[PDB]
Design a protein around this nucleic acid. Sequence first.
DNA 1: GAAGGTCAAGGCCAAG
DNA 2: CTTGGCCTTGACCTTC
Lengths: 78, 80
Amino acid sequence: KHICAICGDRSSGKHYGVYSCEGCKGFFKRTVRKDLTYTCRDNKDCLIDKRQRNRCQYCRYQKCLAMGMKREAVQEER
Amino acid sequence: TKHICAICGDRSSGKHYGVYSCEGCKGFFKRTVRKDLTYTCRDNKDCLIDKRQRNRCQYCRYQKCLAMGMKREAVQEERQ
DNA sequence: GAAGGTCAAGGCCAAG
DNA sequence: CTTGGCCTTGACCTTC
Ligand SMILES: [Zn+2]
Ligand SMILES: [Zn+2]
Ligand SMILES: [Zn+2]
Ligand SMILES: [Zn+2]
């Protein structure tokens, strides 16, 4: 029915405002929650697709935000 | 007046299966009675069931639903 | 009011 | 270790 706006994999439905896969939803939650920061080993323009999404966390978070993922929709830890 | 859930002390959205409960305890009881679910306590069936510790034990949450007066008979069948 | 249903948010844990 | 699949929960809603 839908595709992930960040990597192109199958989308379950919307998560944090964006149509995304379980992977991308999980990764964005974890980053906002633990307040993580990553470093790009390349030139901050890595290909984020199903096969390459775990090659660069920096650019994956960067795509999450750019595609409209909302940090505020990530509720606090139990 | 304002009411609190008889099972966990969360805000009560009204009476549900005869008992003043919240949307959480209401939901939980429905899915338990409907799917005829059976749980098992990892401790000795005395777990505290409050607003922030209710999903830690499904066995005890269900037990307090019954002990407090929720009616299995009030849980209807799936709208086909 | 009090039944019903929905679906994005949660959590867990096996896969990777 | 982190990733992500799968299932539970409950805020918000409609149906009776
Ligand atoms: Zn994705
Ligand atoms: Zn990169
Ligand atoms: Zn409750
Ligand atoms: Zn218990």
